[PDB]
From Swiss-Prot, chain C:
This is Copper-containing nitrite reductase. It is found in: Periplasm. The lineage of its organism: Bacteria, Pseudomonadati, Pseudomonadota, Betaproteobacteria, Burkholderiales. GO terms for cellular component: periplasmic space. Pathway: Nitrogen metabolism; nitrate reduction (denitrification); dinitrogen from nitrate: step 2/4. It comes from the Bacteria. Keywords: Copper, FAD, Flavoprotein, Metal-binding, Nitrate assimilation, Oxidoreductase, Periplasm, Pyrrolidone carboxylic acid, Repeat, Signal.
Length: 336, 336, 337
């Protein structure tokens, strides 16, 4: 569009919500292209990531791991105000895999503590995409300290299957998956550090083994289980967006399926169907659409079951409604 | 269908055979929906997995690693009688990735030793699917002790390519790939245990490294070589089902291809074609269709070659027939 | 085709070029099927794989890691003269994933030092495909010693997207990604060896961890950076062929995309589109097509960022041209709150 045309576009401020929840949005675009405005403040803070009091100096967009899901439509502009308070100790920036140019925005958004920046980019490609911090010389460390999230760029006409039939979800959740690499002393106990930089050398040593100590959803072991399970009802259509900025994952809904799965996360690539377990390579986001058919507790996992059940990569859905004996029935219950 | 309608459907009792062979079945569905009945006894047994006499306490559906392939058609009912003998020591159950509800059947099939159960589920989705044991609190341990297999849910009109052209195999083989995590002593010799539970704590430590000590086909190094090499002839169309319940794999037929590969394992997702090496994520099954064109020895491997030739993920095919010099000829044999 | 019909086919002798460059070729086939002839000499040679001076005894097709990209069209015959000079100490062979029979040619190309062989195969399927050495009993050691490359079998009508539209690249690069497993001493410093065989047992131990010490493009940390950076211009269409003969990778162009990606490497399988990060399993090649829209530096990486930035799997593109503020603009440059 021409300079005047871009300047004339409506500007809309959106308030973000913490994962796994997603801010208000419409699936079908309302009106023509807009400049959708978001603000995130960066927080450096100690978080506890397991039941044994294990700490990480997190680097968190909007104070959360993962950072929040930002939702726009194709050919909207995403305009992010990014703030790095003077209480932080590191330079931070942002790389949007959805964006084109300047290392995804990373080269234009390098902000020291006490600085802010505003980046605008045109969301030319429909899909879910990773975003992450990427300070030159320390890229992986920032990313595995939790400084990553995702955005969704919806097609202007909403989602469709491979045959052009509309796929309209009733709810959407965003599951960000994080590999953490926590140093341990020679006794096997996880170390703690006073300042974020103090952990740098010990952490990189663990990173180089390529073996995470923890693999978690929403920033901690059990963050999406128990009373923090995600919810649905029988007949409800659910979109599950899943990201991993650094390492491969293989999501699986135990008791369910991915009816339609954009495994690559890109909406112009037709979705796979009837999936048992899908695969999202490190550095990407994917999305799965499922209509729930049975009530009960489901587990949603990375189906390397060691990562799921030993390292933390397991969430739950609690689903209300009536049981379908046609789909499944216990013909003879466990008996002597 | 109503319970009454289901009750009135034909029953067919199937007799299972040990992998890599697959029980007698039709590719095209013979008549309307049936209730297909299978029975499996759970055998906790010691298996030797390598030529060094390394032992695993296996947890084995039908006495094998992997468990046998069950074949039904879409919208059939799979009715499994699962038996846990008094000669066992652990609670076992079954999760069918093909099933909808109750953790794939796992919540409804928990049998203590001396108990049995009968689960029925509607096979609504066509494809190959993993099944595995999943006892709450010990899911990865059960799975990496060999308690997994796969089923095939065929389309009622049999297999087709991406454009609806029919694909009929002459032979079918089921390769179950297994990652084992065997503890070692301080000299690097593998440990032996006199009861399954004795290995638990040691085994969990190895599992947490995410690095298998062995990666094997059909339960042991060299299992599908020599007396167990798969066979075919030039001109023959072969389907190779491959599962991995816990860890990624990348099958490759050395000297051949995957002419058609349902890499995600799901038949409503069009297959990839002309594949050199395909990818199956942990927690999934896939299938490749190939027409042999050359005689001789072929190796079928996980194409991480360290996994194939150091850790044990290699099978052979012995193929009879006439050499084709158009496809390949030695113009000058190795010479000075 | 009969031996007589194949004898009647034209011959074309191709001079190979070193990666990441690709020898002259035509996207759309010129004429009917031909016998396309290549020669490679295998070199066992010491190579340096990082800025610290870490050495590997490499086993190298045409003297480079990766070996060079051979380009033919579907239904051409690729005829390779492979030479194992007497200065080498191991038997070598070649397995073409593109080929059908005799373990991809491995069974028919086993040459001791001082020997040569000529193999011909019909390139029946279009795509990019790995080739690698595979001597029985030492297969992964040969491969992770650098003895692998790729070929491209173009469709006779060139590349097209999943819907019949012609895709014509302006330039092509071949990025071979290599996992190395280098033994360390008790200091944690990389060990050097007098002869290739001296390193075997220590190397196999590292290999068994399934954890490479180095993951590199074009044979070394930073090999495709500085004056060796790949180049493009705004508006230019680039095909990037990427191979990994042993271990998975997840390519990503930082600041760009894969507009069309044959993630499986096979051209009869329709490409994925608008990709951020694609996935190529160990034992395969893939190809990505992109039209550059913005000038400046880009990094092309394996998006396990530890692999990219700690272990060496990062290359650079330098792109010339005019910046597009519609696509991206700094509304407010970094400035005090
Ligand atoms: Cu990135
Ligand atoms: Cu499962
Ligand atoms: Cu190979
Ligand atoms: Cu940061
Ligand atoms: Cu079990
Ligand atoms: Cu070799």
């Amino acid at each position: 569009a021409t300079a005047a045309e871009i300047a004339a576009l409506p500007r809309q401020k959106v308030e973000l919500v913490d994962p796994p929840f997603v801010h208000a949005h419409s699936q079908v675009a309302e009106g023509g292209p807009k400049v959708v405005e978001f603000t995130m403040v960066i927080e450096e803070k100690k978080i506890v990531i397991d039941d044994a009091g294990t700490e990480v100096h997190a680097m968190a967009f909007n104070g959360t791991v993962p950072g929040p899901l930002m939702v726009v439509h194709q050919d909207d502009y995403l305009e992010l105000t990014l703030i790095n308070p003077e209480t932080n100790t590191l330079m931070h920036n942002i790389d949007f895999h959805a964006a084109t140019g300047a290392l995804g925005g990373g080269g234009l958004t390098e902000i020291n503590p006490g600085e802010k920046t505003i980046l605008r980019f045109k969301a030319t490609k429909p899909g879910v995409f990773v975003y992450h911090c990427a300070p030159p010389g320390m890229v992986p460390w920032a990313v595995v300290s939790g400084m990553n999230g995702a955005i969704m760029v919806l097609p202007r006409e909403g989602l469709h299957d491979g045959k052009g039939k509309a796929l309209t979800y009733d709810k959407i959740y965003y599951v960000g998956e994080q590999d953490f690499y926590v140093p341990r002393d020679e006794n096997g106990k996880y170390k703690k550090y006073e300042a974020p930089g103090d952990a740098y050398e010990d952490t990189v040593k663990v990173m180089r083994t390529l073996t995470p100590t923890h693999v978690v959803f929403n920033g901690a072991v059990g963050a999406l289980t128990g009373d923090k399970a995600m919810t649905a009802a029988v007949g409800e259509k659910v979109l599950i967006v899943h990201s991993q900025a650094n390492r491969d994952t293989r999501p699986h809904l135990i008791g369910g399926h991915g009816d339609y799965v954009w495994a690559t996360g890109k909406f112009n690539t037709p979705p796979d169907v009837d999936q048992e377990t899908w695969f999202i390579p490190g550095g990407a986001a994917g999305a799965a659409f499922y209509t729930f058919q049975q009530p009960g507790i489901y587990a949603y996992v990375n189906h390397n079951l060691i990562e799921a059940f030993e390292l933390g990569a397991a969430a739950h859905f609690k689903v209300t409604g009536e049981w379908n004996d046609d789909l499944m029935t216990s013909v003879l219950a466990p008996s002597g």
